[PDB]
Amino acid sequence: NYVVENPSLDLEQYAASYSGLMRIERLQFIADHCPTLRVEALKMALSFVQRTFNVDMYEEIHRKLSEATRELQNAPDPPALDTAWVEATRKKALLKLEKLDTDLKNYKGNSIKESIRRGHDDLGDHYLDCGDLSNALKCYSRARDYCTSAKHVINMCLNVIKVSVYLQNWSHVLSYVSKAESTPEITQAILTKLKCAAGLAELAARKYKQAAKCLLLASFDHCDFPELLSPSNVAIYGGLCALATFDRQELQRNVISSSSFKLFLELEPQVRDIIFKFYESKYASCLKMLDEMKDNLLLDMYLAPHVRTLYTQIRNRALIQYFSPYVSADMHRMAAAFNTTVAALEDELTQLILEGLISARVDSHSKILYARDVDQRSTTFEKSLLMGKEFQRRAKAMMLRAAVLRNQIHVK
């Protein structure tokens, strides 16, 4: 699976780039999946978790930090939660929350749709601050009723998208992205935020071809988008998905035409080199860097399971693209076109031929990969004869069926 042992993560930048519950979940993911660095990740997590009235997840994080500190007290041979925080946090949280509940119930008795919608959004934000997922949803799911303006609908969609990411109800995200896009007549770049929401939601839904297409349409003018995904990861997410799905012509057109992914490639020069090396047929340098970035994003919140399939697809596509211009390519040179061994490439090539889309034959005598260019006519005639034989067999079958049905032959 994942949970590997990799050094060199920059905790300060990754924590500061995100903000909110999005930051909290990522810090929890980093700590749980990266040992030998979990303590500082947990120490930084609990330092930020106590801010903005966390109740249930604080107990889980504090318990994990207490276990982590206890582990450090036995290897080179547990912090107090300061329960006064509970007394302080609960009394403060309740008082303002009831006062906010106080004010909104006045507006329910005053009957103003926008005021009711705005108050419930504040209640939803407060519940999210208080650490109440479903409670925030119901406030948002009853503020959706009292909408009056298109911007109010846009704000309603954004709030539901934000919550459903935490709830992992990505179906609700995609539905509200479609509602927020298709309805209002397809400087304020609002569609860019919606496209970013769809791209990450699709990627979390094990979708790659649409996620890359949506991510490539995201303009860099959005800049600060920390509640869902940092721009640095967006560029990484877009580049990996484009590499696995977009072909060479598809890659070149979309990257250049977007003119925002060029900026995204500037933030992440590593993935930019990958596509350029992918284009110029230097898959040896392309894949060695790929493993270097692998360990880094192997501890990414919504990438770790998906990227393993993405990287496997990248290796398959690179091999297909490499051998495509060659009718007879030496397997030694193809093996030398990566750090892989001769035997390992032969097994990988054999697997690719079994799956398909390489159309090649392996001459293991001299270890030379000869491309298969079978004439269309021979295969056409063979499969036409097979089709005729199958048609004759099915004709005999239906002939027998008609005979037995006309003669009323059946077991009583």
């Binding site: 500061a16 903000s19 909110g20 106590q50 801010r51 925080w85 600060d224």
Partner: protein, 557 residues
């Protein structure tokens, strides 16, 4: 005793409000200059300490359906009645005086306390003397004393308010004879009394015989008598005799306001007792002594400091480490911290800047997750509220901000933006040739001195010239990391730097810098026998404090 109120308390006062608004079960009606207020005797008894006697004494008032209550405002009684029917006051900022007057007349204790707490918290800039007379008219000792100290500072500050002219004799004697006058000179109180006495006629001349003797004798032998000769009624002989008697006696003693020594306020120092983390201390440039200050929250740290031209200290933001948007103000005499209106966003190390009487907080990790992370928020020292202003142009961290020529200037790694308060917009300024952060700037005269950064970079900027230039490098010992602090002192630019080496103790020394010499002359070296180590996250600011109110910090040399 079992006094459960879950879904049972509301039901009663739900009905009684419904019964009141529908005019049901009413047996007593209040006539208020022709306005009828049908209500109940029982609700009035539990709320007002006067209505209980209004309906219980064996007088004819008990057997009277219509009672004509006068000297009460209809609106104030109605808001009192509805508060006696729903428990909610919902008081405004204008009708507080009349509401308190009617509450005192009706002896409604709960609303009296609520109005007292509202009044004690809303003495901002102008109503101090007005409500002090209101507190003098109706005994509100807790508010009276709070207003007394508040008036003492503020009245001395303005000393031209028209509301001060009308006052009782006893209140003026308490104000004027007190030793809490925040005045650096003894003649400003003299002329304030003179203008107060010349405002009216003989009736005030009777009070002149008692108020003239509450000032130190240095101002009673002055031109006061010479100006009194033309202002005295004719055929007055004995009045002159008693005036001559007020020269020698009555214990001429120094005041307290003259002890406004210009000092340096420090925060987050190395605490002596290990049970405490940080502490706030002060240093006296002239007295060469180290004073201490009480921590405002006593548990929260990472605060920002600002000093208004009127020598006021404010604290905003910080983390307990949960971030709290609380606000506090330092008392110059009580050595305490009175909280104020909190901010709407929980900031980490905010940078507060004062300009045009408004406190501007620039940056400092607002919420971090803003759609526009580059925002600022200002404070109103008069209205006591926070007003949103134009957001920041660019994202900056560990930045500094100063005020020059009534304009807001914020400094970052290499960029600078000037905020125009009149139009509420940011304007592009000069770009610095060196990228340095983790440093602060000082607003001395018409020049901004950005000192330090990562060092000893001295980059001087002029508003009138709009250019950045180098002057020199501070003389510091090698193999060290100096902690530079630039601040104005005695109308002269000076620095406060500490050098730390390997296996060596920290040394504190301040230098005098000259504009045309580009050299930091040795002004004074702070001896370690009086000042100990401060730390790394300490901050420095300049302001006036009182040695008597504060206490010396005990520490072994």
């Amino acid at each position: 005793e079992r006094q459960i109120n879950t879904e049972y308390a509301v039901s009663l006062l739900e009905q009684l409000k419904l019964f009141y608004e529908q005019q049901l079960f009413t047996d007593i009606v209040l006539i208020v200059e022709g306005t009828e207020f049908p209500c109940h005797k029982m609700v009035l008894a539990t709320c007002s300490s006067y209505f209980r006697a209004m309906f219980m004494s064996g007088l004819s008032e008990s057997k009277q359906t219509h009672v004509h209550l006068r000297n009460v405002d209809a609106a104030t009684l109605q808001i009192i009645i509805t508060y006696a029917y729903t428990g909610n006051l919902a008081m405004n900022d204008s009708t507080v005086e009349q509401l308190y007057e009617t509450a005192c007349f009706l002896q409604v204790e709960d609303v009296l306390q609520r109005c007292r707490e509202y009044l004690i918290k809303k003495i901002n800039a102008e109503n101090c003397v007005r409500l002090l007379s209101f507190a003098d008219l109706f005994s509100c000792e807790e508010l009276k004393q709070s207003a007394k100290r508040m008036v003492e500072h503020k009245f001395t500050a303005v000393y031209h308010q028209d509301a001060f002219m009308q006052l009782s004799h006893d209140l003026l004697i308490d104000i004027l004879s007190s030793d809490n006058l925040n005045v650096e000179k003894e003649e400003t109180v003299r002329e304030a009394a003179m203008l107060w006495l010349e405002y009216n006629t003989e009736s005030r001349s009777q009070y002149l015989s008692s108020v003239l003797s509450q000032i130190r004798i240095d101002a009673l032998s002055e031109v006061t008598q010479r100006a009194w000769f033309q202002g005295l009624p004719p055929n007055d002989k004995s009045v002159v005799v008693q005036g001559l008697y007020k020269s020698m006696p009555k214990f001429f003693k120094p005041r307290l306001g003259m002890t406004k020594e210009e000092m340096m306020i420090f925060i987050e120092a190395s605490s002596e007792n290990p049970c405490s983390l940080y502490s706030s201390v002060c240093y006296s440039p002239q007295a060469e002594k180290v004073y201490k200050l009480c921590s405002p929250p006593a548990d929260l740290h990472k605060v920002g400091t600002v000093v208004t031209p009127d020598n006021d200290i404010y604290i905003a933001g910080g983390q307990v480490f949960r971030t709290v948007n609380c606000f506090y103000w330092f008392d110059a005499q009580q050595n305490t911290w009175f909280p104020k209106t909190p901010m709407l966003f929980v900031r980490i190390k905010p940078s507060l800047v004062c300009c045009e009487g408004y406190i501007y907080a620039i940056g400092g990790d607002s919420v971090g997750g803003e759609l526009n992370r580059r925002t600022v928020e200002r404070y109103d020292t008069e209205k006591d509220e926070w007003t949103m202003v134009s957001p920041l142009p660019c994202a900056w961290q560990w930045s500094a901000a100063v005020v020059v020529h009534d304009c807001i200037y914020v400094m970052t790694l290499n960029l600078m933006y000037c905020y125009f308060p009149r139009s509420d917009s940011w304007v592009e300024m000069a770009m610095r040739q060196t990228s340095r952060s983790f440093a602060s700037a000082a607003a001395f005269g018409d020049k901004i001195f950005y000192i330090g950064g990562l060092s000893v970079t001295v980059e001087i900027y002029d508003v009138n010239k709009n250019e950045w230039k180098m002057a020199a490098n501070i003389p510091a010992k090698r193999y060290s990391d100096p902690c530079v602090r630039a601040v104005v002192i005695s109308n002269s630019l000076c620095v406060f730097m500490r050098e730390t080496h390997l296996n060596e103790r920290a040394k504190y020394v301040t230098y005098q810098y000259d504009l045309e010499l580009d050299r930091w002359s040795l002004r004074q070296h702070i001896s370690e026998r009086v000042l100990w180590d401060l730390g790394r996250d300490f901050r420095c600011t300049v302001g006036k404090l009182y040695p008597s109110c504060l206490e010396e910090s005990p520490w072994k040399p």
